Design an enzyme around this catalytic site. Structure first.
Site, PDB file in Angstrom:
ATOM      1  CG  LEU A  14      -0.474   6.124  18.067  1.00  0.00           C
ATOM      2  CD1 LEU A  14      -1.129   4.824  18.486  1.00  0.00           C
ATOM      3  CD2 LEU A  14       0.992   6.143  18.448  1.00  0.00           C
ATOM      4  N   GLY A  15      -0.555   8.024  13.808  1.00  0.00           N
ATOM      5  CA  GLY A  15      -0.486   8.039  12.360  1.00  0.00           C
ATOM      6  C   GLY A  15      -1.761   8.584  11.750  1.00  0.00           C
ATOM      7  CG  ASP A 118      -3.050  -1.553   1.319  1.00  0.00           C
ATOM      8  OD1 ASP A 118      -3.278  -0.437   1.846  1.00  0.00           O
ATOM      9  OD2 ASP A 118      -2.194  -1.696   0.422  1.00  0.00           O
TER      10      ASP A 118
HETATM   11  C1  LIG Z   1      -0.494   2.854   7.945  1.00  0.00           C
HETATM   12  N1  LIG Z   1      -1.329   2.834   9.178  1.00  0.00           N
HETATM   13  C2  LIG Z   1      -1.077   3.878  10.264  1.00  0.00           C
HETATM   14  C3  LIG Z   1      -0.216   2.945  11.111  1.00  0.00           C
HETATM   15  C4  LIG Z   1      -0.592   1.508  10.828  1.00  0.00           C
HETATM   16  C5  LIG Z   1      -1.686   1.470   9.759  1.00  0.00           C
HETATM   17  C6  LIG Z   1      -3.082   1.611  10.336  1.00  0.00           C
HETATM   18  C7  LIG Z   1      -3.179   2.839  11.349  1.00  0.00           C
HETATM   19  O1  LIG Z   1      -2.754   2.399  12.719  1.00  0.00           O
HETATM   20  C8  LIG Z   1      -3.512   1.543  13.457  1.00  0.00           C
HETATM   21  O2  LIG Z   1      -4.568   1.140  13.027  1.00  0.00           O
HETATM   22  C9  LIG Z   1      -2.948   1.180  14.675  1.00  0.00           C
HETATM   23  C10 LIG Z   1      -3.450   0.329  15.611  1.00  0.00           C
HETATM   24  N2  LIG Z   1      -2.584   0.122  16.684  1.00  0.00           N
HETATM   25  C11 LIG Z   1      -1.482   0.944  16.493  1.00  0.00           C
HETATM   26  N3  LIG Z   1      -0.314   1.084  17.303  1.00  0.00           N
HETATM   27  C12 LIG Z   1       0.739   2.012  16.943  1.00  0.00           C
HETATM   28  C13 LIG Z   1       0.631   2.772  15.705  1.00  0.00           C
HETATM   29  C14 LIG Z   1      -0.594   2.532  14.842  1.00  0.00           C
HETATM   30  C15 LIG Z   1      -1.682   1.620  15.234  1.00  0.00           C
HETATM   31  C16 LIG Z   1      -2.410   4.118  10.935  1.00  0.00           C
END
Ligand SMILES: CN1[C@@H]2CC[C@H]1C[C@@H](OC(=O)c1c[nH]c3ncccc13)C2
Length: 268
Positions: A14-15, A118
């Site tokens: 996801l990230g 943030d």
């Molecule tokens: C910059 N960041 C990247 C994306 C958002 C923030 C915090 C972290 O993602 C999460 O915590 C997510 C929780 N639920 C989610 N659903 C789809 C994508 C990311 C998240 C990584």
């Protein structure tokens, strides 16, 4: 009872890292943040206090060995960051709606004495229906406890979004800092560009804004009504800066602009 209900398959990044997990039995999707511990304790603690429709839900955590797993609400619509077209922004009605949601999540956090610290489009996620959810409590902190406010002094956040007082003063109130960052988010949504690298007098763009040169770039693409709201949020003195209850009374904030989510219809 149901055997395999506890099993989740990690199906895509996801990230540390964030992975989309899918339940083996139900197919329910969640986001699992994986933290290679080799901070998190405060982050988990803060997440457990959270329960609001515009804040990423926390389901629980698991420690395993050295790896922490935080189970979070999955937001399939992605980041607000990706809905902003460079140099363009997005349609005003959409920006107003995302702005109303952001304020609701922020008011909520501030109500429980938590400051995010943030706020920026990368941290603002969208669900299936494009509902905005504030995410990531890794930099968040408690600014009010037992009804006593505590002033902040730690510098954190992301430069282009940070309030000028964080750079100038040793101590500062938490709330106007989050308000400021929401004003930069709004500018980004309406102009598709960030106004300055950081809010310092050494920064030409920032000094032009204080001199009210709104015929210049980001500002000129805006529109008077939301631009008047930005003039009240992006005020250097945090004591003079508009507060949220007042943002809620702003003219643009209350202007009818957007039709509700279209629902199927026929004619006869
Ligand atoms: C910059 N960041 C990247 C994306 C958002 C923030 C915090 C972290 O993602 C999460 O915590 C997510 C929780 N639920 C989610 N659903 C789809 C994508 C990311 C998240 C990584």
């Amino acid at each position: 009872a149901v055997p395999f209900v506890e099993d989740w398959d990690l199906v895509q990044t996801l990230g540390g890292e964030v992975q989309l997990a899918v339940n083996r039995v139900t197919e329910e999707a969640v986001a699992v943040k994986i933290v290679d511990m080799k901070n998190i304790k405060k982050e988990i603690c803060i997440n457990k206090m959270l329960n609001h429709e515009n804040v990423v839900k926390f389901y629980g955590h698991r420690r395993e060995g050295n790896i922490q797993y935080l189970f979070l609400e999955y937001c399939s619509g992605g980041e607000l960051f990706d809905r902003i077209e460079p140099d363009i922004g997005m349609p005003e009605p959409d920006a107003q709606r995302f702005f109303h949601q952001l304020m609701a999540g922020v008011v909520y956090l501030h109500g429980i004495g938590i400051t995010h610290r943030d706020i920026k489009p990368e941290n603002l996620l969208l669900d299936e229906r494009d509902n905005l959810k504030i995410s990531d409590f890794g930099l968040a902190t408690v600014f009010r406890y037992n009804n006593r406010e505590r002033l902040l002094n730690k510098m954190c956040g992301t430069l282009p979004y940070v309030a000028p007082e964080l750079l100038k003063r040793r101590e500062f109130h938490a709330e106007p800092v989050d308000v400021w960052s929401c004003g930069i988010v709004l500018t980004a949504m309406l102009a598709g560009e960030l106004p300055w690298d950081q809010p310092s007098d050494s920064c030409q763009e920032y000094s032009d804004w204080k001199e009210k040169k709104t015929y210049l770039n980001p500002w000129k693409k805006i529109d008077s009504a939301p631009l008047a709201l930005l003039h009240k949020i992006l005020v250097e003195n945090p004591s003079a800066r508009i507060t949220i209850p007042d943002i809620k009374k702003d003219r643009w904030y209350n202007k009818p602009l957007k039709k509700g989510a279209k629902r199927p219809r026929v004619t006869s």
